[PDB]
Write a protein that binds this ligand. Structure first.
Ligand SMILES: CC(=O)Nc1cc(S(=O)(=O)O)cc2cc(S(=O)(=O)O)cc(O)c12
Ligand SMILES: CC(=O)Nc1cc(S(=O)(=O)O)cc2cc(S(=O)(=O)O)cc(O)c12
Lengths: 146, 146
């Protein structure tokens, strides 16, 4: 118990430099501050599930995931997928609090890093589609500091 | 799942105006922002347990309680009491984060309120021992806004 519980915060953020798959799903593991990010063409229940399938392979199974009241997060589909995995689903607290700052900071840091890396490579606008995956993996690696 | 999980933050804060029992155990329920506070002569494993016994009667059984690495919180006694109740015990996270701000804010608000109420009653220093209980209950009621 000496540590923090395994609770994630997940959201989607739009990054046109990564079009056609410009919807970035971002998960922060509040226990490690580790960040996992995947690319999606659309924000659907199935994109959220695919994102978490990847995050589970990378981080392990959390006890709970905190999102907002987004439809992709509150659909019957998504409710059932989390039940199948045994993962509790939670939401932001009270006390003039917003959704969840940590994953929001992560959105920003993530977008700044992609921008820095892309321009360094000579992409001032959209990143060529064949380069996007390696550049995203590089931004994730950097953010995770290791 | 539509709500936040039942996770508490608990700490002790020293309030000489409430001497001889000047150790205040404070629990914030992060799901409701409700505050429970009890008075203790000393900071021991048994004081923490007595405090939580009271907080359970008032708030219900939480899923987890977050404290610091205090001995009263990490003793075998306390570890066993939480196990007996089925309550997970957790700690502060990483990312340059401190222990737990919400319960720290609550310490301050609580001490300011006691001070305001005591002086209003004419107690500029220690609160007479026979008055302390009702004044503490009144400060808790106020803080919980209701
Ligand atoms: C378990 C726990 O303690 N969680 C938390 C601790 C603190 S803190 O201020 O005390 O650091 C703030 C929190 C803020 C939010 S949010 O609704 O704004 O997104 C959610 C939490 O879950 C928080
Ligand atoms: C479950 C959850 O999200 N918890 C939390 C959310 C956020 S927030 O910045 O995202 O609001 C901040 C937190 C800070 C701490 S602490 O180590 O500083 O005490 C602990 C938490 O548990 C927090």
């Amino acid at each position: 118990g000496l540590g923090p519980l395994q609770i994630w915060q997940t959201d989607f953020t739009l990054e046109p430099r990564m079009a056609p798959r410009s919807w970035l799903a971002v998960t922060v593991d509040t226990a490690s501050s580790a960040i996992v990010v995947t690319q999606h063409g659309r924000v659907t229940s199935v994109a959220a599930q695919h994102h978490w399938a990847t995050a589970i392979a990378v981080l392990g199974r959390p006890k709970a995931i905190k999102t907002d009241n987004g439809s992709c997060f509150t659909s019957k589909s998504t409710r059932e997928w989390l039940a199948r995995w045994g993962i509790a689903h939670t939401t932001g607290i009270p006390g003039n609090s917003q959704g969840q700052a940590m994953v929001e900071r992560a959105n920003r840091l993530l977008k700044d890093k992609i921008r820095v890396l892309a321009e360094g490579d000579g992409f001032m606008k959209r990143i060529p589609t064949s380069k996007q995956g390696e550049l995203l993996a590089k931004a994730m690696y950097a953010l995770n500091h290791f």
